[model samples]
Target: GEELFTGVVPILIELDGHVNGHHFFVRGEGEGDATIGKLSLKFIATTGKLPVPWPTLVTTLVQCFSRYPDHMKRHDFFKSAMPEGYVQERTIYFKDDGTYKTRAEVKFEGDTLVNRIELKGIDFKEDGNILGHKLEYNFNSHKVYITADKQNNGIKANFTIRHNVEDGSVQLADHYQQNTPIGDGPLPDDHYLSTQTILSKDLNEKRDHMVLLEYVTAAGI
Candidate 1:
């Protein structure tokens, strides 16, 4: 039985950064695709300062998703944007040179409008063993957006990110660095801030990794 990595591959993550300069933002949703699912980092207050705390920005985004797990997939400009009864079917079974059958199908798809994602020029510097320091980043960019339809009914996934840092340094791990607002940070710089998710179209959340680690230890962090 030992043939892991199976099923439910729905993923959506939004991010914004800055540490020594203080500016943090996050959007989460990965009920599947096993890469540090269910993370809740909160720190809402901008320009007034206060960033890089929330367990060190969730351990620097779980070390950048265990090291760039393919630039966090699912972005081909949202693949012509999906909405009308939205259907996506993907299949692949390649165990080796004897296996391969990539199948993909997408059908009809939006409402109350917004599907903007702009992950601009990512300047890099990565090296972490879980907060051992040395993250030196410069996403010096903004507009990582995504807003959807049906607000009060469900299937509403709203995300807005804005991160512009020439350089951000990190080094402070004693815990609880707060001024309040353990959540919310990603607005202005042109104005935009939100992270709300609600989905239910007869699928009923079944990503199952022990139910997404029970929402990551019940967000005790």
Candidate 2:
């Protein structure tokens, strides 16, 4: 009998806003020895607030995730910030305007099992308002389970994220006030948003190929 080989795949699902129902996909191989043959992403908006040119949104996410390593560590400025994990695997691409857009997925794991941090980002400038210009999203931790057989390969994981919001109150509490504050001085807008997404459908075992799995939303943030 031939020696058995193992392969890995990772998938990323991003949601737009709270109830808009707009999502983006990112996927690739695990980490080492994994090859990312091809990748593509599509963005579908159930609500009309997602803007007309869909490519712009796709471009934003691609730019953000591709540069995640450069800014993940600096996300602690928020009130309820959390550490982001490592980049396992990733794929990103562009599509036409006005229609759906897609982003290639990339995979990444932490240096150790104890590390739950995955990725983090912040927005410090919102509509030129200095006081209300603070927003952060952090992947505090996650877990992945891989099972491969003779005919099929299955991969599944759960990602937990921590969202932080800080307006003027948060800044004022620390005595670090903004020069041009919005509304009633510096207000604190601190909170958390947690979401989980599935990776692969069933277990798989093959040389090299691509698989499209169903996207499901899990409770508990």
Candidate 3:
């Protein structure tokens, strides 16, 4: 995460030597230690007229549309921020051994959100073939359920995430269950991959933030 994080959020001092001079800022919170969690920290700093690489131009545009949607829709920042379609990919690993666990491919088209995920085996026994457990979410459904046969080391889980149109609040919950030797059954042929999990996590948040600016209103931009 450190490598990927550094690319996205540089430390305060890295914003030097720009052809167009501007101030930079930073602030956000981080947390979670197993059964424990914390709001941890909050900080913000800023410069002026940040640069958007041509390659990242559309990426940032969509990001702003996703996180600060009201500003984009209220005729505040831009009259139109939504696009026709978008896609993103994610690869996750087993925390302890840092090996493959699941990979997800997601796409959003206009008003719809679609997600697909599949389990991949560990680094040592990887067969290079996608198999056994596959989960897919169809268009516009923000809810999903995926099951992994226990013996095959596939995931067994249920999850739902919701967003608020009123105030940028979010609520999400996931419940994963387990029974040894995968009592229910699966490929029933997949090798015993060692780690099997049963866990539940829940979160509810309202995003409230403040940014120091040259002007009180975005019209200044």
TM-score list, all predictions:
0.18, 0.21, 0.20
Q: Candidate 3 on 1-221: residue-level lDDT in tens?
A: 11111112111111121212222332322221111111122222234332211111111111111111222223211112112121222232322222223333323333322223333333321221111111111111222233335344333333332212123322222223321221222112111111111111122322222221110111111
Q: Runs in model 3 with CA error above 4 Å?
A: 1-66, 69-84, 101-103, 123-221
Off by over 4 Å in 2: 1-10, 17-34, 62-221
Sorted by TM-score (best first), the order is: 2, 3, 1
**How many pairs of residues collide in each model?**
6, 42, 11
Q: Candidate 1, 205: how far from true, in Å?
A: 31
For all candidates in order, the CA lDDT equals: 0.23, 0.21, 0.22
RMSD (Å) per prediction:
20.2, 20.2, 22.8
Of models 2 and 3, which has the larger TM-score?
2
Worst 10 residues of 3 by lDDT: 54-63
Please tell me which predicted candidate would have the highest lDDT against the true structure.
Answer: 1
TM-score top scorer: 2
